[PDB]
Amino acid sequence: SKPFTIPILTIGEMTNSRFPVAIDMLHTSPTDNFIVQPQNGRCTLDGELQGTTQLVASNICAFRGSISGHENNGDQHQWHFSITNPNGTPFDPTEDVPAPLGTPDFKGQLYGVISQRNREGSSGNGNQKANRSHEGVISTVAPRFTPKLGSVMIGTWTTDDIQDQPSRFTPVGLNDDDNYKQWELPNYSGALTLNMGLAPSVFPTYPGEQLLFFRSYIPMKGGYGSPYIDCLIPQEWISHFYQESAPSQTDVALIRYVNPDTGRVLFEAKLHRQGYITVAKTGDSPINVPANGYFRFDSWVSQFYSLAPM
Amino acid sequence: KPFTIPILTIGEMTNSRFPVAIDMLHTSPTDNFIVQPQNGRCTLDGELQGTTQLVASNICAFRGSISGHENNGDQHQWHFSITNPNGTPFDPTEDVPAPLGTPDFKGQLYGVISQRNREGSSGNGNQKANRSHEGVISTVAPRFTPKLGSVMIGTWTTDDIQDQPSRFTPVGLNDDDNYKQWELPNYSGALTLNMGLAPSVFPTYPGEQLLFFRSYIPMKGGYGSPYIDCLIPQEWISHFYQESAPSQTDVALIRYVNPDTGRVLFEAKLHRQGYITVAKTGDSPINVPANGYFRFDSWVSQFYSLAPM
Ligand SMILES: CC(=O)N[C@H]1[C@@H](O[C@H]2[C@@H](O)[C@@H](CO)O[C@H](O)[C@@H]2O[C@@H]2O[C@@H](C)[C@@H](O)[C@@H](O)[C@@H]2O)O[C@H](CO)[C@H](O)[C@@H]1O
Ligand SMILES: [Cl-]
Ligand SMILES: [Cl-]
Ligand SMILES: [Cl-]
């Protein structure tokens, strides 16, 4: 009964839901040879968050917790980062969630800054608390990347100035993109273990359709390349659907990308109730649209509605 | 038409003056401050003000390019030419204080500058070299002139910053010794006064104080627990901007409710300019359940006497 709506925000006014950066462009490509199963940026149209998705863009690919020395064999440059929920409470692995909310959902070298503020002991003041921050890398393919079990390993370079203190990791980008695989999930509990509670994979089923992504290019610490990350819907749509909780009348909401000045429709797309978009497009290309453009809801249709080609 | 407030808890919302989740509500007297932040400024009918923009991740961020060292002879300092956040060139002639998202406080903004080289005479996105380094942007430096199109960034490296497209991702403060969250930087440097400012705000009704959404900020080093106070959360700003609901009076009466029990913890005045006041005297925390949130109840006058907090 409650009407379903889409935010009127332009692309440049919205945030990637898999990495805390503005969206750079719309993009489409064939993906039938990938398993497209991101865990951040997952929300049904009636507002059900899935996977590791939470509501604060600034907590995507962030970690909170504390350092407990080095790992059981690693370098003097590798540290045991015990992690909590983004709110400070212990992470409960018995819930069917893949990992603490916001955990990265790709195989790669997550680069950012670890910051510490001491808890302090025999004296007392929030002033007088010592602080330190350093660059660090969290490898999501490391044997000690076990966020579902409550810890990840963080590497720092020549730096040994890391204490057993409350810590937070602010993501910046990738250390390199040698083996960055955005459609390969990490093993959230380590080698040879089962990921549970995952948001499902998504795929176009209707002939001639591809997924439409919201794409952001992301920084690197070093090396060559222009890595990017594709999310299914923007973070601001997730926050909007979560609050509205409008029921989905069919499996597919027909949406039109419109220039609000002219009323011209640039193209149409299918917004699936699972929280992802398909277009009638073949090939690997950006979607050129005016900066003022946005998606508008038109009607509820079926999975068999045939979109105009774009 | 009908005005609404998001049903998010504070831990589900973002500070509109620095890209971090909100930690707590706080109230204190502000008589000895000019409270004129430029980020996190939006009217209830959805008019963005100051340097406010809609992407939380762009708060205290810069995009642009490095053009060598700054005018002096300091090998640690670099000239950061800045653009609009969407990559278009910044126009200094408009009545805006600075590029959107520029920091609105005096302090040492600490973060990471990242570079991805532009295409040359061979070229792929695959052939572009990258580098990132820690850096600090002092908002009181003589060369902090964002309204003139550039800021100075200091780095520990002296030799691995190129004249290339650059972005600054904020992380926190370098230290907090002279961090003043209620003092605006000189967006054009020392020769020129600030322009295009969102107006300053203060309580007026007897016994009222501003209510803030407060977040602690990380530091690169040094001692302290700095925090930053915003007037309304970024997610409220995004909501009001989209709704553009007309403000029926100058004051929305809002009640902070525990949704478990339905009990009202306290009531407050949400002013049409986009800030909150409460009936409380003194520097004080606000003890509320983590699940609570503000609910819009009715439009009242500036003369409405709030129940003491
Ligand atoms: C962590 C650190 O100290 N990095 C240095 C280092 O960076 C190098 C290094 O990581 C090698 C390892 O094979 O790979 C690159 O060369 C990397 O440099 C980075 O990437 C290249 C492509 C350039 O864009 C370079 O500017 C960038 O830093 O050495 C460099 C200088 O050689 C810096 O000293 C880094 O801080
Ligand atoms: Cl490991
Ligand atoms: Cl380029
Ligand atoms: Cl360095």
Numbering used by the authors:
A (entry chain B): 224 to 533
B (entry chain A): 225 to 533
Study authors write:
Noroviruses infect a plethora of animal species, including humans, dogs, and bats. One such group is GX bat noroviruses (1–3), which remain poorly understood but are gaining interest due to bats’ roles as reservoirs for zoonotic viruses. Indeed, a recent study showed that bat noroviruses bind histo-blood group antigens (HBGAs), which are co-factors for human noroviruses. In this study, we observe novel structural factors on a GX bat norovirus (NPIH26) capsid that restrict HBGA binding and demonstrate that an emerging genotype, GII.27 binds an HBGA at a common pocket using X-ray crystallography.
In the case of GII.27, we obtained X-ray data showing that a single A-trisaccharide molecule bound to the P domain dimer, as previously observed with other GII genotypes. P domain and A-trisaccharide binding interaction was mediated by a network of hydrogen bonds, a hydrophobic interaction, and several water-mediated interactions by both P domain monomers, which was observed with other GII genotypes. The electron density of the bound fucose and A-trisaccharide molecules was clearly discernible and modeled during the final refinement. Overall, NPIH26 norovirus exhibited a divergent fucose binding site from human norovirus and had structural constraints for binding HBGAs, whereas the GII.27 norovirus bound an A-trisaccharide at the common GII HBGA pocket.
